[PDB]
């Protein structure tokens, strides 16, 4: 192994790391699936939190998602393994060159060929994802009562998302690739700065110019909820401007500056809210009453007051800086390219692909995991901020009702949930909302 050629050590290590992660995640998923199969009546830590009918409905939902997840993750690991072993990436590259030369563009036009590759690669991935997304939407989600869309809506939506993605992706990619080629030895600072500016622009225009292409937004109607939101926002110096409702119910009954609220979150504005004896119980409808929406807003506004959003932005740009720096260190190493079937050329984009996705693999995994732990910490802090606003009782209630409307299963394997859950389990959140309050607490 030591004496194995570097190009073989590189390829082998990327592929073995892939398989290792996949086996670790298959192991974890099995432990969680076992809980769905095993935990067949409500535990006593939970009598007050779910009734037996909702519990079975959630267990059955989550178990179908888990089975679908096993097959998706097996197909995805196989497809990736086979692409790597049989050179699908050099193949698609050479195929992109072939399109270029029948349009009169020779190999010297590398960025052009790169943009063709970007189009085909994203198309391929879009196409191979489509059977799975259709099955999840029109079998799993349909079966358990959540899907609201037709196939025609689904396909209209998919094409529009793909087109809009290309409209932004390709021009931005031609420039970033140019910048990389024309800077140096400090090109990576300008590469980093350009991606920061693109990221800033995109985030600044998304609400007005991209989001309304895909969803219907309407102002929250005048009433008691609109006014309590305004009071709360003032109370924390939040410069609330307008409250909008997004008609998520065009897609799904699931429920999740400006404030935007899903209509499925709102008992009295959900579009989806608008028999042998009882009949009456068939009045159990979706969304949260107003005092619950407010506590959830209290939580969301905690992410703002506590500066979590600013911390996430800083983390992502420091990470982006670090990766562009290391890309600069590594991109002259011709063995990295040869590992993946690029012998006669070292295209810049192929370089980004290999270094950011393959070589940086272990760092990407460690960082994902670190961000997941941090996320859990921020969620407890946002819950605690709503407690501090005086809304613990309503947030407690809110989390139970949303868990029910979305059929969350509130028992999890501790290892699976440590690895995967960006929000702490429901029961851990409810216990935290029950604790005491405040005095001096100056016992540092
Ligand atoms: C325990 C370790 C284990 O492999 O669990 C196998 C688990 C199941 O373990 P099991 O021991 O619970 O048996 C399951 C039997 N049924 C389904 C009838 C309940 O199987 C898998 O998830 C395949 C994952 C492969 C990743 C683990 C690699 C094992 C080491 C080689
Ligand atoms: C689909 C095939 C596309 C091939 C293009 C490869 C693009 C690789 O990433 C380029 C990075 O450019 C943006 C910089 O963003 C900062 C990256 O920080 C995270 C790095 O991890 C990437 C893997 O998720
Ligand atoms: C010089 O070469 C350094 C490249 O390191 C690649 C290690 O790959 C790890 C992928 O899991
Ligand atoms: C290459 C295309 C692959 C197509 C995707 C199939 C995904 C397989 O997952 C199936 C397992 O879970 C599905 C559960 O939903 C069906 C419920 O059937 C009714 C049982 O009462
Ligand atoms: C060689 C590994 C490739 C794995 C990809 C196959 C994915 C398609 O499989 C669909 C699974 O459908 C299974 C139906 O399951 C019965 C119902 O659920 C239990
Ligand atoms: C020679 C080292 C192999 C030890 C780890 C086994 C990896 C198995 O994971 C495969 C899972 O993905 C399905 C597609 O890959 C099938 C080939 O795996 C064979 C591993 O030699
Ligand atoms: O296609 C997506 C499937 O990916 C599986 C293998 O891809 C190689 C990436 O290796 C890094 C994974 O840690
Ligand atoms: C001729 O070269 C073909 C290389 O293989 C192309 C297919 O690789 C991806 C398989 O999945
Ligand atoms: C068969 O052709 C295989 C094409 O697969 C290429 C996958 O490229 C995606 C880039 O990661
Ligand atoms: C619930 C909303 C679902 O809308 C369906 C279309 O969404 C756009 C993307 O298409 C689904 C993702 O497809 C997987 C990759 O092809
Ligand atoms: C495999 O793909 C499964 C597709 O499931 C149905 C898709 O079309 C249903 C529209 O009624
Ligand atoms: O070609 C035109 C659209 O075809 C792609 C269909 O599915 C797209 C799914 O969304 C992908 C977004 O990257
Ligand atoms: C993990 C805690 C989740 C709660 C807060 C979510 C905050 C969103 O953070 C994601 C930010 O990433 C997008 C990058 O934005 C680019 C802005 O560019 C910087 C301009 O100076
Ligand atoms: C070959 C390694 O390149 C090192 C890249 O690191 C930044 C270089 O900036 C100073 C070069 O003179
Ligand atoms: Zn939160």
XYZ file of C-alpha atoms and ligand atoms in Angstrom, residues 10 13-14 17 330 333 335-336 358-359 361-362, ligand 3:
23
model
C -5.885 8.607 -3.949
C -8.954 6.124 -0.498
C -11.830 8.196 -1.832
C -14.041 6.374 2.500
C -3.707 21.273 -4.207
C -0.960 18.264 -8.123
C -1.746 13.073 -9.564
C -5.163 14.240 -8.246
C -13.655 13.798 -3.341
C -10.450 15.007 -1.664
C -14.672 14.240 1.698
C -13.464 13.587 5.292
C -0.610 15.395 -2.239
O -1.734 14.535 -2.207
C -2.640 14.826 -1.150
C -4.038 14.306 -1.499
O -4.700 13.723 -0.384
C -5.792 12.907 -0.799
C -6.394 12.069 0.326
O -7.693 11.645 -0.055
C -8.577 11.431 1.025
C -9.974 11.194 0.477
O -10.770 10.551 1.460
